[PDB]
């Protein structure tokens, strides 16, 4: 429910170090090809990381449905970026079960894409406004998970991060390790000015 938003800017990115770091569960990029990621210059690449259950990881896509995909995280329909998910058990194997996580069960209004669901306070489910007693027709939205090593392999905890860089918005700053070249004039040549390509 509380997903961080770590901005990145004014540096050089890479993708080659994100191929052999670990055999991730999924490295899937909507709107961009993951092989050409080190060729174009982006505009204020974002970063949002969290942990979810291994079977609902399918919910991370632009336009799906599911408890996380509805009440926790909403991607835009025109999402343009990569999602990287990898199984986190060796570092998240709690024999007693780690219950320091929370997600929503019911919300009055569903979230528009890219909205922090900070409404993490008491919630009302049905009739008889209960004023915070969680009785009948009042079910708490914030529920924990079942992450333990004895838990099902599809139900294991997983660490996910979504690189969501918007393109063609401002002077780009995040293009990778490509090397510059001298400037030549009065010849029909191929150029590349911060992604702006042509002849």
């Amino acid at each position: 429910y509380a997903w961080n938003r770590k901005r990145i800017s004014n540096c050089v990115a890479d993708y080659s170090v994100l191929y052999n770091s670990a055999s991730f569960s999924t490295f899937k990029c909507y709107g961009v090809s993951p092989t050409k990621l080190n060729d174009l210059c982006f505009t204020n690449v974002y970063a949002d990381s969290f942990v979810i259950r291994g079977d609902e990881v399918r919910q991370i896509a632009p336009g799906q449905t599911g408890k996380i995909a509805d009440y926790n995280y909403k991607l835009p329909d025109d999402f343009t970026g990569c999602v990287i998910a990898w199984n986190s058990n060796n570092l998240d194997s709690k024999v007693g079960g780690n219950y320091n996580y929370l997600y929503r069960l019911f919300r009055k209004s569903n979230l528009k894409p890219f909205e922090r669901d900070i409404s993490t306070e008491i919630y009302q489910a049905g009739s008889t406004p209960c004023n915070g007693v969680e009785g009948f027709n009042c079910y708490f939205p914030l529920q924990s998970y079942g992450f333990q090593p004895t838990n099902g392999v599809g139900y294991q905890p997983y660490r996910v991060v979504v690189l969501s860089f918007e393109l063609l918005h401002a002077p780009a700053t995040v293009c990778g390790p490509k090397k510059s070249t001298n400037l030549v004039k009065n010849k029909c040549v191929n150029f590349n000015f911060n992604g702006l390509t042509g002849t």
Partner: protein, 50 residues
């Protein structure tokens, strides 16, 4: 004068048509070609072509 004006408007509209998405993710062939793999970029390129 109407002849010149009509031909100029026709050419202006034809050349301005080059800046519409028509459904694809962009309006520049080089962009789609440089940030998408061919087997996927075919659909965008084909929308632009049509």
């Amino acid at each position: 004068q109407d002849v010149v004006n009509q031909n100029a408007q026709a050419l202006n509209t034809l050349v301005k048509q080059l800046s519409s998405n028509f459904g694809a993710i962009s309006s520049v062939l080089n962009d789609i070609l440089s940030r998408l793999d061919p087997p996927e970029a075919e659909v965008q390129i084909d929308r632009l072509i049509t």
